[PDB]
């Protein structure tokens, strides 16, 4: 209940919003229903329309009009954004040539330079070039300012998700919003576009942007819109709250437009129907900064322009049923559309198999546009697990196609030509980035990055300190001129070990086995310079990863690799090595192919054994330095030390394998040499965090070996390939991966043929950041390079897509 017979007189878009049922007046009181009798007379005044003419001129004031063009209207704040360049002889700001802002340039009693954060819905990166003819104002914002050429939205990339993801910093796993519609089990209710539901604050974790500027006395525009006031009447407002009184004016203002994704729902991404929303929009930009430029803010706001994702190619007829893949298709309930959500129906159901339903949609057809994970098997780079709202069956489906439960669902619901929600990775997804104003740099293109960095930005720009996020606090300093936050390495919490030879062979019952017994005088000092870390500065180029937890470990040197041996995994947690672009690939030899050999550094009670993968008939195992590529056959025999190896699923191995004799290979004479780190990671609670000892729900069978849930490898090189990995002088280039560690390929349709159909698209499906390896595996990578550390944090961020242009 709301008594809604009160006044907005004097209160239009006013800021506290009032405790009801006394009746509101605040931008969103329409989406409760709680408006003042007077709300629309007084607050969305339309006479006479947005613009001044050249009659309005110094008029008397008629407190009707939508805005005004009267003599008083600057010392009121509610001149028509116009109102200069038509009674004044005053330039649009578009008509400008762009000056650098060297330094803030604001009124008295401005203490910090205002923020607004301009987002438009479903702007697509390409629209920048492809509707650049069509844009003057955001093309000045975007050459003038600081610009990616595109900024990865997260996943799902859906309004809310991504929405809540820019004032959050937080995966949509963090921060709750995990679609545009869900399902809660331990509240018992759901969350939909339409209706009241999603106003409840239980959906809502983490901290918003406006949350940590009330708790830090910086003041707050209101980031919510209710959907009918238009565009026109929320620029006004921003302008007229920014000529409130320093102590009741805000610092950050949020401005939301529906197009274009609106329309490109409707026409698709590139429709003749859509230069004119572009138009709309770009005018509306126009009609801000004609508005800061009469108040002299223009050179004062910071002025972020912003997308939450792109929008793709779909129409009705590329729709998959599941009703073509299962019988059972109403014990189900789907989440539809460009991803796919299952779960049962009903919950007093436990006929229900999630294992015969993936079964059921696994490479079920020659074409099919679909794949089903469970949602721990989801590639890590798209975090897209940790949440009880997310269901454990997940299909990722292909660009331009829908999934859909039966027929009837899709014509009793062509409507559409247009849609999102598809993987971050694919380009037509990807969206902008345009900072412009005193702390953005000056005419400067950045490299693109991801979406939930920018909390942390917009707190720098706002003199705040940003909660817990997802972003790498640094990673973003390149795109200002100053307000920079200084980034700290963390503090290595645990020292290594460097144990020398302390174990006779005969101490040793593993069950191993190596033909290796035969026999110089001169090379006996050499194999021990090596096991010292003479050839250390060649296989580890940027110093030793940080161990950031507590725990017991060993540094192993060796020829051709260096590792850290985890006492208590019974494994390395890293092991580093380079291969240049002139290495040999060689094959184990024949007497060798079995060959495990005990390590004299490291003793028998923290070593792995033979016997438990010989009576374990599921696992087997392989090394992390791949024997293919020793410098020597004396060298070989290292990379067969019980140290170095790791348990893997046959399945697995075959993926492994093709890696290591071939693709490294690869890579180092395409980037001229490459410097690799590879290691296990175990994460199954799937929180994409470390996991400790007591998490571990696998071990190789009658053994505390700990069995992986997923490898990564690191791979390393000079950004310019004309100097070779190991002598590099500038930026360093690097892509990364995180494969799930499993006994079946069924994630690869084409598996049945030879590695070089299928494995490589497997491990680019599963690219990484090394940040997501080093959330995952507690190590902090680059401790020792020439570069600045804002720089490598940037690498640590840097995800290779593999997407074209
Ligand atoms: C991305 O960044 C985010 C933000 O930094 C990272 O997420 C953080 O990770 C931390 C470690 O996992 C986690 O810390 C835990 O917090 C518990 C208290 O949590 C509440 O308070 C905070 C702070 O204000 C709040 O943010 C939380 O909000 C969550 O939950 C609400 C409501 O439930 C949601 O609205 C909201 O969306 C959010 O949900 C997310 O987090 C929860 C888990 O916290 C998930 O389950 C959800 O799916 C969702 O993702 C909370 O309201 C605290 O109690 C924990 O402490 C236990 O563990 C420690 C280990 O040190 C131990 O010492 C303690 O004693 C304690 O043990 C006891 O509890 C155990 C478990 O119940 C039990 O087994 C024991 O027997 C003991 O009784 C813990 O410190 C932090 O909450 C989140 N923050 C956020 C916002 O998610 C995230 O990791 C980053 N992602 C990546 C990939 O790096
Ligand atoms: O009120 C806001 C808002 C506006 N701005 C913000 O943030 C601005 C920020 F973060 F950038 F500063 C924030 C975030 C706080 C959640 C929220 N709204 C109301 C709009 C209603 N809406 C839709 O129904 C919709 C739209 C497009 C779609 N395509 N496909 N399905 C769709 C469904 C999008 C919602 C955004
Ligand atoms: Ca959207
Ligand atoms: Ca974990
Ligand atoms: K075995
Ligand atoms: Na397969
Ligand atoms: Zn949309």
Known sequence: WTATSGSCKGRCFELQEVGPPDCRCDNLCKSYSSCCHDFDELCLKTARGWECTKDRCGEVRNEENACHCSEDCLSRGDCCTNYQVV????????????????????????????????????????????????????????????????????????????????????????????????????????????????????????????????????????????????????????????????????????????????????????????????????????????????????????????????????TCDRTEFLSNYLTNVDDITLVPGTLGRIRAKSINNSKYDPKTIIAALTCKKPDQHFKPYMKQHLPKRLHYANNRRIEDIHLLVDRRWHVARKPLDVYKKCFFQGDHGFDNKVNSMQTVFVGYGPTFKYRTKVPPFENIELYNVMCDLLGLKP????????????????????????????????????????????????????????????????????????????????????????????????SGYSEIFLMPLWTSYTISKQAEVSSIPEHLTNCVRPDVRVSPGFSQNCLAYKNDKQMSYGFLFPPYLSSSPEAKYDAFLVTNMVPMYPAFKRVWAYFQRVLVKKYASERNGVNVISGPIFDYNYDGLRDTEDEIKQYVEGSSIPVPTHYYSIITSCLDFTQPADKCDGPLSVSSFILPHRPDNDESCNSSEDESKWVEELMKMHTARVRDIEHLTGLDFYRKTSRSYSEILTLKTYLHTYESE
């Open 87 to 314: 009674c004044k002889g005053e330039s649009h700001w578009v008509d400008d040539d762009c000056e650098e802002i060297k330094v803030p340039e604001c009124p008295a009693g401005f203490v910090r330079p205002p923020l607004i954060i301009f987002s438009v819905d479903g702007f697509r990166a390409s629209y920048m070039k492809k509707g650049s003819k069509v844009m003057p104002n955001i093309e000045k914002l975007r050459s003038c300012g600081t610009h990616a050429p595109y900024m990865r939205p997260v996943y799902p990339t859906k309004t809310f998700p991504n929405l809540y993801t820019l004032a959050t910093g937080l995966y949509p796993e963090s921060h709750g919003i995990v679609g545009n519609s869900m399902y809660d089990p331990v509240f018992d209710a759901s969350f939909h576009l339409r209706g009241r539901e999603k106003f409840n604050h239980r959906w809502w974790g983490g901290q918003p942007l406006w949350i940590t500027a009330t708790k830090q006395g910086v003041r707050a525009g209101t980031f919510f819109w209710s959907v009918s006031i238009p565009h026109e009447r929320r620029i006004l407002t921003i302008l007229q709250w920014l000529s409130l009184p320093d102590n009741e004016r805000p610092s950050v203002y949020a401005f939301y437009s529906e197009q274009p994704d609106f329309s490109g729902h409707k026409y698709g991404p590139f429709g003749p129907e859509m230069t004119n929303p572009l138009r709309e929009i770009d005018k509306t930009v126009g009609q801000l900064m004609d508005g800061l430029k009469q108040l002299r803010l223009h050179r004062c706001v910071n002025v972020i322009f912003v997308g939450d994702h792109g929008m793709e190619d779909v």
């Open 467 to 562: 909660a817990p996020n997802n972003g790498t606090h640094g990673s973003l300093n390149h795109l200002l001129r100053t307000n920079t936050f200084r980034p700290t390495m963390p503090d290595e919490v645990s020292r290594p070990n460097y144990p020398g030879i302390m174990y006779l062979q005969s101490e040793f019952d593993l069950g191993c086995t190596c033909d290796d017994k035969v026999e110089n005088k001169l090379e006996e000092l050499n194999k021990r310079l090596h096991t010292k870390g003479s050839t250390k500065e060649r296989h580890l180029l940027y110093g030793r990863p940080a161990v950031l937890y507590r725990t017991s470990y060993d540094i192993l040197y060796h020829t051709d690799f260096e």
